[PDB]
Amino acid sequence: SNVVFALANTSANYRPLAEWFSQTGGKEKLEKLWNDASHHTEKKITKRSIMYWAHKHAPQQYKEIVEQGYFSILAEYVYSYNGMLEHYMIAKVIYAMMGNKFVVDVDSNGKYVWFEFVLPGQPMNQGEIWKWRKEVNPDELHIYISENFSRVMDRITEHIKYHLSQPHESNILNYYKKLLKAFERSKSKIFNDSFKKGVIRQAEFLFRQRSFIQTLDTNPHLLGVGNGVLSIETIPAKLINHFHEHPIHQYTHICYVPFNPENPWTKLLLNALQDIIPELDARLWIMFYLSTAIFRGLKEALMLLWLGGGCNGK
Amino acid sequence: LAEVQALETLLTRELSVFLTEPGSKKTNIINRITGKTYALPSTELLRLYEHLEQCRKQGALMYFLERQGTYSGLMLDYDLKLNTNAVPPLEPPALSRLCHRIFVHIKNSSVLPEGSHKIHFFFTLKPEVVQGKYGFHVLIPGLKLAASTKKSIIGSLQHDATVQKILHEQGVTNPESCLDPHSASVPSLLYGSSKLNHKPYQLKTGFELVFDSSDPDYIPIHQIKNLESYNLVSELSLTNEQGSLVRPVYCAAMLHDPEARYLHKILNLLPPEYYVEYPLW
């Protein structure tokens, strides 16, 4: 179900389906055929999930194949238009290269605000660990265009030099020399500020989501926590500490859930909350109502009054 | 530079498939600039040597080492303390006599094959004296020796009175302790290569020694005249077996990897004056 909702965005998804479940037995999941051709569903996991389905059991080959794809896209862009590398081809390679980390929306005033997925090897504030943070200028992408993409730039240069150092004819060598010199004049443009601003403003149309702000914190069962993302769909707390498709932005920097141990702090908190007011048959209503504050709505409309006493536990 | 670009393409596109793990004995070639280790088959070793030779003739920065392993050519590493900061003369007669004495110890090891055989000696010299410190390598790349035999030959050479005399008359003040006793085991710089803080040793003179088991008292030593005609990285290599001048004679048998970016703080982690640390540790 996960992979079928992942690649259901493709209109011709049945050919990857027949490729994948052709492997012990299975037989198209006993001829399920997308559960006998089901209709559209909620926004499940996307294409960006599959490269995180990989990279945890096979990182080297995944890195090599994405690097080869990056080199292929840049090589076809360089060969199609001899040396001129304008804003859109750089934006296309950048979208292919960081497409699972950045999105952009047109939320309120017609302005294109960015959202960056954070990683543990990044400077966050306190608790933005695995959730999208709002950005006015893509500073990480601005650094990434000049630092990481320049490695692909020298890779393309090295391939051009290798093709130049070959026993070809004179006209092919002249064409490759012209391509190399035009490419070398255009290579330094990826460090220019105006060019990088144009690349960002062109990738704003390519990193689009069209529904990102509309569903940011719509669901109530996903909660922003200091250690990552907390989920309360099932009885155990999931504590999502990996890449995920859930597009939550707001968070609590001080929650920091350590699951639920029975250490000294939890014991003293429990001894503080109870053993002060006597209850019959383990009555627990008031601190059960202290819960359900981690939900959005669609619940009971109760209204509790704690008032009473001067220096009590209010 | 074209020939450096060519070597870069050979290494990354083609020889990358021979990359060895750290501490893998299979390793025969070490590129200390890229920190890469390789096990090159003879065909790919030669292709490497053609590229390194072109890079050498254009004075390119190389730091290639070959691993001697258990059976390969002999290398002698001399670290000289001199009377003065003048390059010692080291003319053919002195170097010729050195070859003869080196050979007497090889012969005395009893491992030479019977019959008539040519073996080549090459003397590469430190380009200048620095504070009276000087050096030469003696390469006998074609004479394939067991590591244990090399160690034995080196032991004997350290105590050779005639060698000590020759070195003394050249102005050497450490003639008893100038031969590195680990000459047998250390990885050996390819011709044209050096530590990143040093300049590469230059080939001054090579000699052809013919020995004949039937005529043991006839040991002709002559200067090699057309050295420039050969691929010198190739010929001087202790592990090469496919040289043109040098034909083999078979005798009886750091992990921080900064990658030019993160080591800068190392450059300012030395001049702290933080020897004594009561609060500062």
TrEMBL record, chain B:
UniProt superkingdom: Viruses
Coiled-coil stretches: none
Family, similarity comment: Belongs to the asfivirus helicase C962R family.
Protein's recorded name: Putative primase C962R
Positions spanned in the full protein: 21 to 321 of 962
